[PDB]
Amino acid sequence: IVGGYTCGANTVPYQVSLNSGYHFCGGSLINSQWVVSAAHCYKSGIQVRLGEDNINVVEGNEQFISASKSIVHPSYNSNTLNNDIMLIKLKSAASLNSRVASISLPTSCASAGTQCLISGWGNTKSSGTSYPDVLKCLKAPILSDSSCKSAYPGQITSNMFCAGYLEGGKDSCQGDSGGPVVCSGKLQGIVSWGSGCAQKNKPGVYTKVCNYVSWIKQTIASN
Ligand SMILES: NC(=[NH2+])c1ccc2[nH]c(-c3cc(CC(=O)[O-])cc(Br)c3[O-])cc2c1
Ligand SMILES: [Ca+2]
Ligand SMILES: [Cl-]
CATH class of the missing domain: 2.40.10.10 (Trypsin-like serine proteases)
Known part of the structure; x- marks a missing residue:
């Protein structure tokens, strides 16, 4: 993270x-x-x-x-x-x-702007590797599908969604893969991929659990 x-x-x-x-x-x-x-x-x-x-x-x-x-x-x-x-x-x-x-599985998918909690023991550096000993947390919102597709043209399927900050600086990273994206107490995503970590206009992509x-x-x- x-x-x-x-x-x-x-x-x-x-x-x-x-x-x-x-x-x-x-x-x-x-x-x-x-x-x-x-x-x-x-x-x-x-x-x-x-x-x-x-x-x-x-x-x-x-x-x-x-x-x-x-x-x-x-x-x-x-x-x-x-x-x-x-x-x-x-x-x-x-x-x-x-x-x-x-954690509970969702009954409905979440909307853009929903705030979620992402956690993991993945890399904490965007430019280099630093792995933490304790668990790190990040609060991030789900982005609209248009911003997500705009960021990753041709690479986003209906089973993915983007969450994060377009300004860069805050994101999940290698090591966090497979972990949880919880929004309002339901597991809405799984940390999957992204271009680098915390890069501007390259938010993280998550598997759409719903x-x-x-x-x-x-x-x-x-x-
Ligand atoms: N920007 C993000 N939100 C993000 C999220 C999960 C990620 N997982 C990975 C990832 C990278 C490697 C690189 C390597 O081959 O050493 C390996 C794994 Br396995 C990853 O999950 C990158 C990565 C980036
Ligand atoms: Ca321990
Ligand atoms: Cl597209």
Whole structure:
């Protein structure tokens, strides 16, 4: 997260860290046994870390659970990043409490101007790499589809939306991929891609979760 602030320990109880000997992507807990992340974060040997704040220190509240299976959306396109969503089933259910909790799926899509909370342990530099130990937060609005298409002509599908600041300086970045974009208590987006991080007129692009609710429910119901 570039230009964000320190969230504060366990203030984002649905945020998870995908770990393979290091933190490589974020995710959101949607129930005690399932996590939603981005398809391009897929790899084998994933350990999901819940209740984290400092990812380099065991501070208490952490639950480390292996993923039993990862389900990348069948129509995911790694060249356009269209349908950049993945569901991860945990080997055992997590113990939910005030520090570890799931976030709700939306019932409707959000409108432009909606303010959302984006969080993650991704890079904090736009010009260089600096990875934080604790969780960073960024409040950002969803932009209109016209501004988004204007910024990324020909690259925005109906399953994506832009959120951020056209002036640059505040944005999600590598390392934050797969994590949550929560607006009014519902998971509306998944951090997916952008041109650089925090560059002027190059806002972040997020997977539009409201377009996948039925797929998520049906897939979880059958696995
Ligand atoms: N501007 C944004 N809002 C944004 C959001 C997610 C991002 N993810 C990535 C990303 C970049 C790499 C670069 C590399 O190959 O080292 C790798 C991954 Br995986 C990313 O998700 C960039 C990136 C930018
Ligand atoms: Ca920790
Ligand atoms: Cl276009």
